[PDB]
Design a protein around this nucleic acid. Structure first.
Ligand SMILES: Nc1ccn([C@@H]2CC[C@H](COP(=O)(O)OP(=O)(O)OP(=O)(O)O)O2)c(=O)n1
Ligand SMILES: [Mg+2]
Ligand SMILES: [Mg+2]
Lengths: 406, 557
DNA sequence: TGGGCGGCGCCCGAACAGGGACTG
DNA sequence: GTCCCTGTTCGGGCGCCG
């Protein structure tokens, strides 16, 4: 029996145009959809359904198997009372503290559960064609779609019945469901952890990605160490400490600022006085302390900001309010000589989102340092998760890049 | 006849009711044409007579048709359209001849009375009610309603396209080696079959369309090249655009410039080098379609060049999927770019232009990146593949720009082409302060109420300078201060500013700007040999910043 | 007189949104 | 708060197809 699903009051369905697809993704989608239609998972619809959600396809790593990926971000925003409140799943604070967390794709399960008939229209999508040989061919789901916030919500009771025996027997393993995946964490040794995972798979016969969140530390703000300081050096230092005091109000600057009195050449050398030396060491100390008054608000959304530091280096901050960071960090890569900023950026978005899902049960909204058209032209070439975060496109102010650099 | 296909269920929007609009007066000519059409349609069950039980009406009219002495019947369904439900449009783009592959055998068919062969939802027909008059005081009126898709209704194009697709589906499914380009009721049908076998398959297709109620009249059955299709002439090894005729007006009106630019944009797909920047400029301040605009001398030049371009014979070729796609880009002036896409050296599949101005201040590397991304998306649409690029930018220039630039940027596989004008950065900012170079601390202040301001500098060598400005702003006065320092310094200089605004513009290395002042700054920056720009927080008593700050403040209270 | 509909394209300008700097 | 500046979106001309 189906579960009646409503939309948020006052909101309509998604009307999002389909973006162009390469030939091989179109071929894969047409294969996948012929199979899905034959199995009853989807049905052809026409243009009197006014809703649309974009579709595309990704390939599993070292695989030849394509995967259909529906961008249900709008539909998810428009059902957010249903999946977040009415049939929500709680998030465990111990999951992030485990030695190992394995991610298991459990999405297939949803295709066994029928979707409410009144709601199927909202799941409409359109397959396009090379050179517009044909108008778009339209479908809608007849079963819980992968990628819809409603699917794990509705499937929650079955998943709990399925996991009750395994949880009972293995009571120190924590299992957290997020949208298409199970996150399975334990403090076992890697040999015995893996067998426990390839024990849960046998159970789930009614791949995997390995994570070590107990080793995720924070990236402190840090100040330059040098035995010779120029007027330029001290101007840079004072500017950075001035910005930092918006976060750590104990940052003091006047004893360094006093070294700069007058109109001097940028390259002239300036010995640090005892007063300024002690001020600088005290500032170094203050930066090591936790930021005061940062309390996670589970009602508000997460904001993730990213900066390109150059040479394969990226920095990022997760916050809900300005200057009150929940997390900071970096994403580093070897000097590739064939470096792809777009690919590195999507890899970074995925790592950050994975971390947020493990820590807060929430994906963040990304401020991305890239032109919209570049990102939209190429990001799906490198995407490998089933979820997709929200994002918007920003022109990072050069000073901000300078402040979080390492 | 009328297709036996299921109808598409169609609704009014919640709470709405059918249209009740009086009928216009019409020509004797249009009345006669409409009665001739409607008696035949009623005979064929495509429209049905209606009586006083239908409280709806919508005006009808008629227009001549393209290549005929025949009339198209239209209904001004704007009211019903506003009250009719939304549709999702399945026509996602316009097919392009350069995406066609060579075929041994080619046919073009035109479906007869296309809309009037697809039936309309039983429950929705009452709203399509119209009426033909005999004369304002002659007779009652014809007073029919539609049983099929009417021309004028917002729902008819999508419902027809979706119906045509459902009808073609089994035929495509059992004929994978035949390609059918389906744009609204015209069908391009290509195959590699010998002419005999191809004509048998064509007859199968036509019989199949007949079984679904769609005729293909022989008057519109094209069988020999050149085929007329989507605005082009398809020959066996090349395609051309049907001729583009530009106006030769003496006085020019805004509507005329719109028509001119529109024809130039259409021509730029095959004719290389079209530019419309100056013609487009002629539209900036306008406020009426009837306002006469005089051509600037620059617009005169641009239009003459486009004319000479259009006097040349040009053609495209078809796509060979076993060869690489190659896109080649050339810089023109003033934010304009041309490209050619080909697979063999002097045999274009198509051409194009990109001239969208983005940003107050930008440079040629940003613009070239935007052009590459546009060409990439257009190529994925037409051929489903990304092209290999030939670009007029040095690998080193691109390496430097992507290394120093703080936004993620990327360009797919490309090779350098050494035909000028080349794309360069025209100055670099130093990463470290310059030994020996004079250090200028600059600042500027502006009075919010009086608009007067001051800009100036202090240097480590004792030089001071302040200039007063009128009708200015804080941001303008900070740019003035930097400009002042660039003018007065030697070939190597360090500059300390407190304005994030000016720092942000200058670090992005613009080579063109909407602001005249930023253009002057750029000319100076290019003249320098080394420039180091530095930022300090304002109003903190720092360094020389404090001295300039005091100097440029006699308009801060 | 032309007058209706859907699709895609281009270019411009009006309406907003967001962030830095400033007032007393 | 106000003012300045910049970037995005969207409608409304026109072009082309049907
Ligand atoms: N200005 C126009 C042109 C066309 N359309 C629609 C879309 C295609 C369909 C063709 O009808 P249609 O009766 O077959 O007319 P055609 O000119 O193709 O003639 P044909 O029957 O082949 O002789 O009309 C429209 O709404 N507005
Ligand atoms: Mg026709
Ligand atoms: Mg200032």
């Amino acid at each position: 029996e189906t579960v009646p699903v409503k939309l948020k009051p006052g909101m309509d369905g998604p009307k999002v145009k389909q973006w162009p697809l390469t030939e091989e993704k179109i071929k894969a989608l047409v294969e996948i959809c012929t199979e899905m239609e034959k199995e009853g998972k989807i049905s052809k619809i026409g243009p009197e359904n006014p809703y649309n959600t974009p579709v595309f396809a990704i390939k599993k790593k070292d695989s030849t198997k394509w995967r259909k990926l529906v961008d249900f971000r709008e539909l998810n925003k428009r059902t957010q009372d249903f999946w977040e409140v009415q049939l929500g799943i709680p998030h465990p604070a111990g999951l992030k503290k485990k030695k190992s967390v394995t991610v298991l794709d459990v999405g297939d399960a949803y295709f066994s559960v029928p979707l409410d008939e009144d709601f199927r229209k909202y799941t409409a999508f359109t397959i396009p064609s090379i050179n517009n040989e044909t108008p778009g061919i339209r479908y809608q789901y007849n079963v819980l779609p992968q990628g819809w916030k409603g699917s794990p919500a509705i499937f929650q009771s079955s998943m709990t019945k399925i996991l009750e025996p395994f949880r009972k027997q293995n009571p120190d393993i924590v299992i957290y469901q997020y949208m298409d995946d199970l996150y399975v964490g334990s403090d076992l040794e890697i040999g015995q952890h893996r067998t426990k995972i390839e024990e849960l798979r046998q159970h789930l016969l009614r791949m995997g990605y390995e994570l070590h969140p107990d080793k995720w530390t924070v990236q402190p703000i840090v100040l330059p160490e040098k035995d010779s300081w120029t007027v330029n050096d001290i101007q840079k230092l004072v500017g950075k400490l001035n910005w930092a005091s918006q976060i750590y109000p104990g940052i003091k600057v006047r004893q360094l600022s006093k070294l700069l009195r007058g109109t001097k050449a940028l390259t002239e050398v300036i010995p640090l006085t005892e007063e300024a030396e002690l001020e600088l060491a005290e500032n170094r100390e203050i930066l090591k302390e936790p930021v005061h008054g940062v309390y996670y608000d589970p009602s508000k959304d997460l904001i993730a900001e990213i900066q390109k530091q150059g040479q394969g280096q990226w920095t990022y901050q997760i916050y809900q309010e300005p200057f009150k960071n929940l997390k900071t960090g970096k994403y580093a890569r070897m000097r590739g000589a064939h470096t792809n900023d777009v690919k590195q950026l999507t890899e970074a978005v995925q790592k950050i989102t994975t971390e947020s899902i493990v820590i807060w049960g929430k994906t963040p909204k990304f401020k991305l340092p890239i032109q919209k058209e570049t990102w939209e032209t190429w990001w799906t070439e490198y995407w490998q998760a089933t979820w997709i975060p929200e994002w918007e496109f920003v022109n990072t102010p050069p000073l901000v890049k300078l402040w979080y650099q390492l | 006849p009328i297709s036996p296909i299921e109808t598409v269920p169609v609704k009014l929007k919640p709470g709405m009711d059918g249209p009740k609009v009086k009928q216009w007066p019409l020509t004797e000519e249009k009345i006669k044409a409409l009665v001739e059409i409607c008696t035949e349609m009623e005979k064929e069950g495509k429209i049905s007579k209606i009586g006083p039980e239908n409280p709806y009406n919508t005006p009808v009219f008629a227009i001549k048709k393209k290549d005929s002495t025949k009339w198209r019947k239209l209904v001004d369904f704007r009211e019903l359209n506003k009250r009719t439900q939304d549709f999702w449009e399945v026509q996602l783009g316009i097919p392009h001849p350069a995406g066609l592959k060579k075929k041994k055998s080619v046919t073009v068919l035109d479906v007869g009375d296309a809309y009037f062969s697809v039936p309309l939802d039983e429950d929705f027909r009452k709203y399509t009610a119209f009426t033909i008059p005999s004369i304002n005081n002659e007779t009652p009126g014809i007073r029919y309603q539609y049983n099929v898709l009417p021309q004028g209704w917002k729902g008819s194009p999508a419902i027809f396209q979706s119906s045509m697709t459902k009808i073609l589906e089994p035929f495509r499914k059992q004929n994978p080696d035949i390609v059918i380009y389906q744009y609204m009721d015209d069908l391009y049908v290509g195959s590699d079959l010998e002419i005999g076998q191809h004509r048998t398959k064509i007859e199968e297709l036509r019989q199949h369309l007949l079984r679904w109620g769609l005729t293909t009249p022989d008057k519109k059955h094209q069988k020999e090249p050149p085929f007329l299709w989507m605005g082009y002439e398809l020959h066996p090894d090349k395609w051309t655009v049907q001729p583009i005729v530009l106006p030769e007006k003496d006085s020019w009106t805004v509507n005329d410039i719109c028509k001119l630019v529109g024809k130039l944009n259409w021509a730029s797909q095959i004719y290389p080098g079209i530019k419309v920047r100056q013609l487009s400029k002629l539209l900036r301040g306008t406020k009426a379609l009837t306002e006469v605009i005089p051509l600037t001398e620059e617009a005169e030049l641009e239009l003459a060049e486009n004319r000479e371009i259009l006097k040349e014979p040009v053609h495209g070729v078809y796509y060979d999927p076993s060869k690489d796609l190659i896109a080649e880009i050339q810089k023109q002036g003033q934010g304009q770019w041309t490209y050619q896409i080909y697979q063999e050296p002097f045999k274009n599949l198509k051409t194009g232009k990109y001239a969208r101005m983005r940003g107050a201040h930008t440079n040629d590397v940003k613009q070239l990146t935007e052009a590459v991304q546009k060409i990439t998306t257009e190529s994925i649409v037409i051929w489903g593949k990304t092209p290999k690029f030939k670009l007029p930018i040095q690998k080193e220039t691109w390496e430097t720009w992507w290394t120093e630039y703080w936004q993620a940027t990327w360009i797919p596989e490309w090779e350098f082409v050494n035909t000028p004008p080349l794309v360069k950065l025209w100055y670099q900012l130093e990463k470290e302060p310059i030994v020996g170079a004079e250090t200028f601390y600059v600042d500027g202040a502006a009075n919010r109420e009086t608009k007067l301001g001051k800009a100036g500098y202090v240097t480590n060598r004792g030089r001071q300078k302040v200039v007063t400005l009128t009708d200015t702003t804080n941001q303008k006065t900070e740019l003035q201060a930097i400009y002042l320092a660039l003018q007065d310094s030697g070939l190597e200089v360090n500059i300390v500013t407190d304005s994030q605004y000016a720092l942000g513009i200058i670090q992005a290395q613009p080579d063109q700007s909407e602001s005249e002042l930023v253009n002057q700054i750029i000319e100076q920056l290019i003249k320098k040999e080394k420039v180091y720009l530095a930022w300090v927080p304002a109003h903190k008593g720092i360094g020389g910043n404090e001295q300039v700050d005091k100097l440029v403040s006699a308009g801060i209270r």
